[PDB]
Design a protein around this ligand. Sequence first.
Ligand SMILES: CCCCCCCCCCCCCCCC(=O)O
Length: 133
Amino acid sequence: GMSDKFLGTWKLVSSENFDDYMKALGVGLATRKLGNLAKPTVIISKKGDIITIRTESTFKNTEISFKLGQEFEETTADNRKTKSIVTLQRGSLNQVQRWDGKETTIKRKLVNGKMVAECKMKGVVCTRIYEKV
Ligand SMILES: CCCCCCCCCCCCCCCC(=O)O
């Protein structure tokens, strides 16, 4: 299953190309401004085979709980209603969100003890690096 090394609290320390990623998702200017200033904490926890990813920031909090390989209904930080799934690939925790015929992926992987989230939409690639805190 998911490596226990994902478990804990993570703080954003670097974000590359988030503005263009949000644009690809259809997020408007005023929301993007606040999104670009946000430095969220991401808390990853488990209970049995249910994994929870909680995001906390001044602007927006989100939480998803899921079992690997089992599609679920998600409400994203920008209030998209998606059909989502999370699965593993070579230890990477990989999320797909699907709505209105569109799709975006968020792949979270451990790299030298840091958590790297690669967010892709329509050719746009955003990389967000987290320190464990
Ligand atoms: C909670 C931070 C984002 C706040 C701004 C809302 C605009 C839409 C953001 C959608 C993508 C959320 C980031 C997922 C990738 C990650 O966990 O680093």
